[model samples]
Target: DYPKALQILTEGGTHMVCTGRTHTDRLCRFKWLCYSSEAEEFIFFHGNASVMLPSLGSRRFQPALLDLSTVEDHNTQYFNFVELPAAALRFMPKPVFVPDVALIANRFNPDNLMHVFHDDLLPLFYTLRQFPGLAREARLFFMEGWGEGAHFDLYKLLSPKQPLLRAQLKALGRLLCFSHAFVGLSKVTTWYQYGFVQPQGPKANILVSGNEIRQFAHFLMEKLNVEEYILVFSRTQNRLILNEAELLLALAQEFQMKTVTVSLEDHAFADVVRLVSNASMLVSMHGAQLVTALFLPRGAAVVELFPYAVNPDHYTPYKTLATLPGMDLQYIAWQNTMPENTVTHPERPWDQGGIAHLDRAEQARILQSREVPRHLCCRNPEWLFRIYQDTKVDIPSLIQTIRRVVKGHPGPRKQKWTVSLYPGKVREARCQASVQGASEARLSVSWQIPWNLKYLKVREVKYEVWLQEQGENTYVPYMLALQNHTFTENIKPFTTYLVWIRCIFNKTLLGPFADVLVCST
Candidate 1:
């Protein structure tokens, strides 16, 4: 593998990534940095890249951030994707009361495992990443973003970072540069997920002040008029931390849903999908928590928690993604309580009576906003693409602009090849000669001779053919969509033509090729 590829290396709770080579020319070491086990934490890797670049020559390098997100999200932390076929998404879902939907998370793809290596759906992976969730209960799966591709893994080759290893690889590089880069078992970030369910509903409207969160669930059970209420829960991580709830727990409790631990993690991608599929709603704070809601069944509601002044003046990542239409959401934003109580001494589900505060009016506003929320495409979003209403722009310039946004299409566009015929198809035409139809261009003066073509191995090839015309200084290029064929000595009235066939492995420039001539009847 190349010197410093982007891959993870774990050192207990501490992890390091080798993102780029020790660039001697720049005198700086570059690497993507990350450290978080919580679900909704803001990912700081991108927001710090540029600020950290200048301090390279000296070892006293402090990392910087490259802010990928300039704006906050709508829908708080609940988000979803473009509508999925109900039957299709049934196979996947998120947990209740949380929305953590995304196209590709850093933890999910890590280095070279992005889906581009395997399928054409790679672009869709990124497109879906920017939306909010529909259901309160959903399972998270960055699994949708998984794919395969070519890369270099250096850990195997440079197993022991010693003096001898460096010299050997440097020498080996010369022999293998023409082929492919070497890869190794470079240890990378091991992605983890777990799940939890929050037990809160509209039926529980009765609770005295200063009651434990658990009592609220029983009150809800009696109000909903069910025979009994029981709480169900499971965990996947080795050790659970309370600090993770610092934001959402405070927000939920301030709103009196403090008993709600609606957001949870999963042990694996598949398991998360299963859990969300059966969920009733999702609950979460801002950040990655909403990404899981992308898999919920069509037309589900996401009950997300937000701690902000909800208005046009502010935007969050959760809102950014969930604004897409069909993301049914109920964003409940609240200021912190007098003394925040977000985590349980032993973390458990939230059952605070305060959650019942969402009267018909409050729920109505959220429901209205949740309906077909397509405004996320942008209220006044200016497109980066340039367009000319008239043919004022030249063909070449138009092509260039189109390429910037219409990704996957190669650019700059190549010139088309064309061939044409002359009078009666009898004589050879020049390269630039204007060609008529193939029938008009057809002609032949048959001849027989021994044909011998030669030998060479070529990596790539294509054939260019064109008809020449009289009174033309050069051969006109052929702009053609041609079919395959062969001709015998008794050729139909054939056109004088030029054929240039060769193997060209390089893409830099069009090469000089031979052209033949034919007659037209």
Candidate 2:
């Protein structure tokens, strides 16, 4: 096997085929891709059978060949390799070949639960789906240079083989090679952008829907292993709820249902998923653990509480996720307006919301401010100070917030899954023009229903008609319940008009337009 692998590497060298056009979207497949533990860089050997698609030349360094993580174009997360001729392998150490199919990528952040799910797990799960060869048995190589952090077990569940760390690769040999590898994570399933560029919010273009998310949830539940009670996801170390017992009592009394509490520190991750998957409502101080709301059954309510001076609107990673179309989860935001109810740790380290290092006057100003100003990612002392504060939750206000969203028992309703279906283009469009007098004219347009309408039992169907004068930039539009409409107003003799028609289903689902009709008046 060694002799054959050595011959393949020496003769064929490396071959690469990538899927995306830009570094942000690129996913590369490689054969005979080797790594050098001494140089701490991936190596690509050139030979007669070697290939590199989109060979950027020196432009590969313009930014990078691809993003190793799901985070878009972050400077520290770029991936590229050192190139060498195949003949140079003679002088290099004997290579240790990885036998299993490899998924080589970076974990954006493994300490926090949100980044583990949003930045790593979801993307990796779907990325594996993109390549048929990289399945449950594939070996994951984490090249981010981080140790197995807190949520490493969740990553392990993605693959059967033990994930190899960057440091562990050195144990194999100085020259290590992967026989087959996929070199980037897919960004298609990501929903939120973590304010690295702009403010943190939902992505502008969300390609994944609730269907895919639910499917993923099902897969994970099957791999691991629920009730209609309210789940109070508590945090012990930071962002403490001063009166968790009282809050639990209030929730149970208000909903007339049992209440349960779970924390990442006390409960195993699998147990938390098992509880969240069945809960009717999840209540927690806005934090990374709230990302588990994705596991809640349909019709669940997510109550995200904000501390004093921290605007709930400014930070909505979980809200955006809970409210994604078809997610069907009710979202509520409650902020503590009373400063007396919030406990801030200004003496703690700066990273943990401490303001003692700042000038006395600046610290005083931050303390007096009613709200944290909208800021960019990571280090904003005032934002951190306000966010890290513990809260004695105002139970009445929280109950009122939940009441506004849920009238009765807050739980999953026995309802059919609503699949949104769009209509196809309207067919057989025609327009006729009539000139009654020298100064008066009218245009009538008619079209048949969309082809898919017959197959679907849509509740309400409507049509949109647009009339544009020849050589005009603006068009007059009309919404009609029927397929035909006549336009008399603004009609003029000796004028040419262009008509466009399309179908609409249930008001929001827009269909494509049929062929344009031209008429002379």
Candidate 3:
């Protein structure tokens, strides 16, 4: 009966169905998937059961699911569908239907951990959660025209099924149909930038916080089987840390914890995760390797070391990750301020910091600058030069920085076990205003606790109220422990006032402000 039903779906001609809300929300499941060798495009032939999760009509192809190569120009970013009728099946070659659902996306860079996490892994993760059962039997399809990357094994952990390369599809058959298919990249969940297209900074309105990241990290930990220790990520070729042996000794003595070092070139990715997962502290020079801090246990400390000329505040991708809300990890940064402790490889290749190839004036200027100014992403000679330099450890200074941030001890065990939960918007907020004669006016504001406040125990609860005249640019603020508060201090008769109220927990966990209250007095 199932075969007959599927056959009917294949033979009944073309139709379109959708379940998502917007273009970003769309995922299409096809009846028959086809590839055009001439055009080099993916095709989905329509039938009675063919479904486009978001039926955007002409808009389906605009803005793409994700861009290629981390570049966002319209020319580089593309996602579109090619369709043919089910009646054409007889004229076309035989179709090979895959058993597993297909999640098709591009890998920006498999070798770079920052790119691997930001562009590929993180988006793929939440994209699966958007649709039910996507993680169960789904096979990943890399459409970005790249072969197996360095971290292919890490990607395999996302699903039980083996990932298929673009070229490998030709081996299976030309006319391939997916049982369920999703084409395009999941760029919505990415949180960091590598300075490819713009100045490096944390992305806007980051949807993913530490909660989801820790869950994913914990999954890797289960596979890696880590121990409680301190992990240092080592760079084999570039950005080397001079005096690493002495640095490790000092760290071990200062922290009194077993210290482990792992490198992308020397250790398997799983082994790195294994050592980093249970680490009490992860100390490493500023580089892509620092991304492993995600695997650090809750309450772990990430100490990022900067070379002499590079400012810690300017390059902050990992720092942003470590400090995300609910991530619960301690972060410390130490910069080599002494020029004597730095090593510059100006004689190396152009990409590695050589200025001999450039004009003499520019080379001299780059050599003379004490610090690299904030600039656009890739190919900035100044950025490349400063970033690639190695540094000798200033043990005393580094130790002092760590001690300043970490009071008594560092690591997850030393911190409180519970997650610091934030409150939602206050409910049923209302305000009243009264004017006494022509000289005095008072405003009263009240709000119910946040809906989720009743479910958990909180140490402190307070309400913040703001009162402002209708046309004034500034507002008077008041804090109260009660749900209801009356303010008469700055009252003015015959003046209209606006009131805003919000709840705060433990004087830090702030709730979203309730709808504005208008009370004309």
Every model's TM-score: 0.23, 0.96, 0.86
Winner by lDDT? 2
Q: Is candidate 2 or candidate 3 better by TM-score?
A: 2
Clashes of each: 117, 0, 2
Model 3 misses residue 255 by how many Å?
A: 3.4
lDDT of 2 by residue, 148-174 (tens): 999999998888899999999888899
Candidate 1 structure quality by residue, lDDT tens digits, 1-521: 32222211111111122233422111111222221122322112222122333323333222222111111111121111121221221243211111121112112122322211111112222122222331121121221222221221211111112112212322322211111111111111101111111111111222111121112223322333321110112222321222343433432333332222332443333444444433433433333435444443333334333221222113233333233333333222222121232221212111211212345564344323312221223221111000000011122332233234333312112324222111111122222223245533323222111121123233333223443444345663332222222333222233334443221222322333432433433
- lDDT by residue for model 3 over 1-521, one digit each (tens)? 44763476467533434444544444445444556544557675676666655555666556653343333333444556577887777787666667777887777778788878777777777777767888786788887677787788878877778998887887787677665566655556567665646777887667777888888777766655544677888888988899899988988888887888888888777787877877889999988888888878788999999988899998898899999887888999999899998888887778777677788999989988888998986678888888888889899999999999987667876457667787888899887888777787787878888999989699899888888889999998889999998778678777788888888889888888888888887
Model 3 weakest lDDT span, ten residues long: 65-74
Q: Rank the candidates by TM-score, best first.
A: 2, 3, 1
Name the lDDT of candidate 1.
Answer: 0.25
